[PDB]
Amino acid sequence: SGFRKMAFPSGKVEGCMVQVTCGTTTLNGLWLDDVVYCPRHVICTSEDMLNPNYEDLLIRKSNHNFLVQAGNVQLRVIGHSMQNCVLKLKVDTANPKTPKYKFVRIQPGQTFSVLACYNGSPSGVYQCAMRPNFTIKGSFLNGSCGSVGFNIDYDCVSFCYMHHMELPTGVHAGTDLEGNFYGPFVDRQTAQAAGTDTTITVNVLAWLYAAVINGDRWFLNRFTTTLNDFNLVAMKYNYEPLTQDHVDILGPLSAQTGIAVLDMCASLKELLQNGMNGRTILGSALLEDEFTPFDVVRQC
Amino acid sequence: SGFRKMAFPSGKVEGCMVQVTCGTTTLNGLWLDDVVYCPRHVICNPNYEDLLIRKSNHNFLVQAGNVQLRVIGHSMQNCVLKLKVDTANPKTPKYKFVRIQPGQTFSVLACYNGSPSGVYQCAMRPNFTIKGSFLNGSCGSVGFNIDYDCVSFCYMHHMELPTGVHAGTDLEGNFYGPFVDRQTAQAAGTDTTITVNVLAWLYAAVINGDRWFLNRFTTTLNDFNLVAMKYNYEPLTQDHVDILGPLSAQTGIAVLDMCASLKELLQNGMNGRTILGSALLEDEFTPFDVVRQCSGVTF
Numbered sequence: 001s002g003f004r005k006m007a008f009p010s011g012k013v014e015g016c017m018v019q020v021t022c023g024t025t026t027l028n029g030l031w032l033d034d035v036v037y038c039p040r041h042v043i044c045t046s047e048d049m050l051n052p053n054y055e056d057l058l059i060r061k062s063n064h065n066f067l068v069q070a071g072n073v074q075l076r077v078i079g080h081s082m083q084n085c086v087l088k089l090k091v092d093t094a095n096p097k098t099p100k101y102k103f104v105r106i107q108p109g110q111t112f113s114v115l116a117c118y119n120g121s122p123s124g125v126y127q128c129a130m131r132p133n134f135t136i137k138g139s140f141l142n143g144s145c146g147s148v149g150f151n152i153d154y155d156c157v158s159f160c161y162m163h164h165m166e167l168p169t170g171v172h173a174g175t176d177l178e179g180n181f182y183g184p185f186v187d188r189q190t191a192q193a194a195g196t197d198t199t200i201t202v203n204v205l206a207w208l209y210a211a212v213i214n215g216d217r218w219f220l221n222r223f224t225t226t227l228n229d230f231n232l233v234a235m236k237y238n239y240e241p242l243t244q245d246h247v248d249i250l251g252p253l254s255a256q257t258g259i260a261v262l263d264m265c266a267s268l269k270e271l272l273q274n275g276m277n278g279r280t281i282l283g284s285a286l287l288e289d290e291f292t293p294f295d296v297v298r299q300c
Numbered sequence: 301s302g303f304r305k306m307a308f309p310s311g312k313v314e315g316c317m318v319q320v321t322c323g324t325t326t327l328n329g330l331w332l333d334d335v336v337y338c339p340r341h342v343i344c345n346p347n348y349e350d351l352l353i354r355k356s357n358h359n360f361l362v363q364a365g366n367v368q369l370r371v372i373g374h375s376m377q378n379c380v381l382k383l384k385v386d387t388a389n390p391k392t393p394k395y396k397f398v399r400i401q402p403g404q405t406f407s408v409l410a411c412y413n414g415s416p417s418g419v420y421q422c423a424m425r426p427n428f429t430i431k432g433s434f435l436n437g438s439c440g441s442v443g444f445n446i447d448y449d450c451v452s453f454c455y456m457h458h459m460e461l462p463t464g465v466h467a468g469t470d471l472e473g474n475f476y477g478p479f480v481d482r483q484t485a486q487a488a489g490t491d492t493t494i495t496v497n498v499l500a501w502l503y504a505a506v507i508n509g510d511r512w513f514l515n516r517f518t519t520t521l522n523d524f525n526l527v528a529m530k531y532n533y534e535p536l537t538q539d540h541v542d543i544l545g546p547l548s549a550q551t552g553i554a555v556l557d558m559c560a561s562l563k564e565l566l567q568n569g570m571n572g573r574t575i576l577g578s579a580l581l582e583d584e585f586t587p588f589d590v591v592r593q594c595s596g597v598t599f
């Protein structure tokens with residue numbers, strides 16, 4: 001029993017964290033086999049950030065301009081290339097601690113663990129979700145760039161995020177491990193802002209099914225709803241549209257609890273209308289949207 | 301910016317998790333040097349000295365990854381079983397066994413069959429239970445803090461209470477709380493809110509730019525404790541006020557000035573507003589957790 005925001009064990013990722021320095025800029029890198037992956041803005045100064053020409057800044061660099069430190073050991077850079085917004089530094093030593101891994105690009109609503117690091121040293125691990133507006137509500141101070149997001153299934157680490165920047169509202173933006181940003185963001189200090197964020201509906205429903213599995217049914221009602229009527233109501237509360245794919249994905253949780261997806265939708269409609277009336281659901285006074293259907297099945 | 305419930309990196313502890321099987325019971329063990337520590341109920345009104353004397357070393361099967369460790373000795377220390385093995389753990393980190401106080405926080409590496417599945421942050425409640433996330437097979441999972449390169453082990457999971465909360469021991473086998481390792485009618489006592497932690501979380505909210513709850517008022521320690529007692533909040537001591545000193549100096553909000561803000565939140569609610577994305581007052585971040593997360597301390 002119990003339901004917590006749970007992160008994956010971070011050990012396999014801790015053994016990949018290195019410090020990357022170029023000039024006066026120091027950030028984190030991910031060392032897998034003989035390559036160190038890091039944000040390409042490590043080659044920029046503060047002035048360069050307004051309109052940097054990364055190809056022009058990179059051509060002026062040689063291998064020995066990049067200092068890579070793994071623990072108390074200096075790695076030698078023997079090659080470098082840029083792939084989108086990621087810099088790939090070829091080193092002379094393969095990481096003996098390289099886990100079994102994949103690079104995966106995730107969709108909004110998906111969750112992952114973040115290993116926050118400073119100077120190539122891990123400081124903490126937390127769980128979060130890719131928001132519908134493609135930002136993440138993380139906890140990152142200056143120097144955390146290059147910290148990574150991941151999931152672990154079986155013995156395989158799936159890297160899905162690399163941290164690049166903090167937006168003016170305090171939220172964070174980054175890329176997949178191929179250096180493609182999530183969202184309409186650029187690694188430029190131009191006027192950028194997070195779009196209006198919405199609640200991840202399929203995740204709130206999964207969390208309501210987790211509450212039922214743990215013995216809480218106070219919020220259920222005798223009503224049902226059509227998918228279209230549910231969406232017309234939910235959009236009025238800034239909730240993401242619920243698609244047929246979402247209904248299909250909730251199938252297993254519906255079968256385990258005996259409550260139809262559209263009946264759980266009717267319960268959500270009523271919670272949005274009434275609030276909690278001094279009550280909590282799984283120890284929370286707000287409707288939680290950072291647990292996916294997959295996370296609920298895994299933890300419960 | 302940002303404030304998350306953050307756990308310590310679990311790598312140093314992952315390298316110590318093993319599977320312990322005795323008869324039909326399988327749980328988790330902690331392998332440090334040549335000893336495996338696990339709950340003594342793995343041998344199970346039990347008489348543990350009588351149940352243990354009937355066991356031989358080969359009755360305990362210890363699995364570290366895909367390798368069987370051979371048990372060469374066994375002894376009991378309070379509610380923990382210590383299994384001497386032939387191989388010292390080459391991944392043994394620098395460590396200490398520490399007993400924590402209610403209100404203190406720690407990371408839990410939840411394990412099943414000696415395999416870590418997740419890491420989360422929690423606090424030892426004033427009633428000595430922990431609000432964890434544990435299923436059958438999680439016994440022997442451990443709680444810890446990391447300071448510098450040293451792992452301080454503070455908790456080992458033993459059981460779940462009827463309200464869904466959890467009970468366990470320190471690594472010397474002494475239970476936290478009035479609990480026993482037997483199937484008997486046991487219940488969590490009435491819990492209270494950890495006041496010093498709620499104040500630390502209010503200082504974290506101010507540091508991150510949330511100030512709507514601040515007011516022009518201050519209070520005295522005695523008046524605040526009369527209010528705290530009414531709302532099932534733990535008494536705030538002079539030690540708590542001293543511990544909040546650094547956060548008070550950084551934000552310019554005196555501890556009894558923040559107590560006056562907390563009194564207003566307790567008497568009037570939040571009025572549709574939130575603090576760090578929460579509609580409840582959070583008490584599972586200590587003053588040290590707030591300082592550590594708002595400064596980026598590494599391990």
Ligand SMILES: CO[C@@]1(C(=O)Nc2cncc3ccc(NS(C)(=O)=O)cc23)CCOc2ccc(Cl)cc21
Pocket residue numbers: 041049140141142143144145164165166167186187188189190301
């Ligand atoms: C070079 O990193 C930038 C950045 O967003 N860094 C950060 C990432 N995470 C957390 C942070 C917390 C605080 C902070 N403060 S400050 C005064 O801006 O240095 C910066 C952070 C600095 C600001 O401009 C940009 C513009 C684009 C890009 Cl892709 C990166 C950055």
Ligand SMILES: CO[C@@]1(C(=O)Nc2cncc3ccc(NS(C)(=O)=O)cc23)CCOc2ccc(Cl)cc21
Pocket residue numbers: 001341434435436437438439458459460461480481482483484
């Ligand atoms: C032997 O383990 C006991 C136990 O509390 N285990 C658990 C620990 N954590 C999480 C759990 C979640 C669910 C669960 N379900 S069950 C198997 O139907 O009891 C048990 C859990 C269950 C029997 O009563 C006792 C009596 C004393 C002791 Cl110290 C332990 C236990």
Ligand SMILES: [Cl-]
Pocket residue numbers: 105106107110
């Ligand atoms: Cl995805």
Ligand SMILES: [Cl-]
Pocket residue numbers: 565566569570579580581
């Ligand atoms: Cl409140």
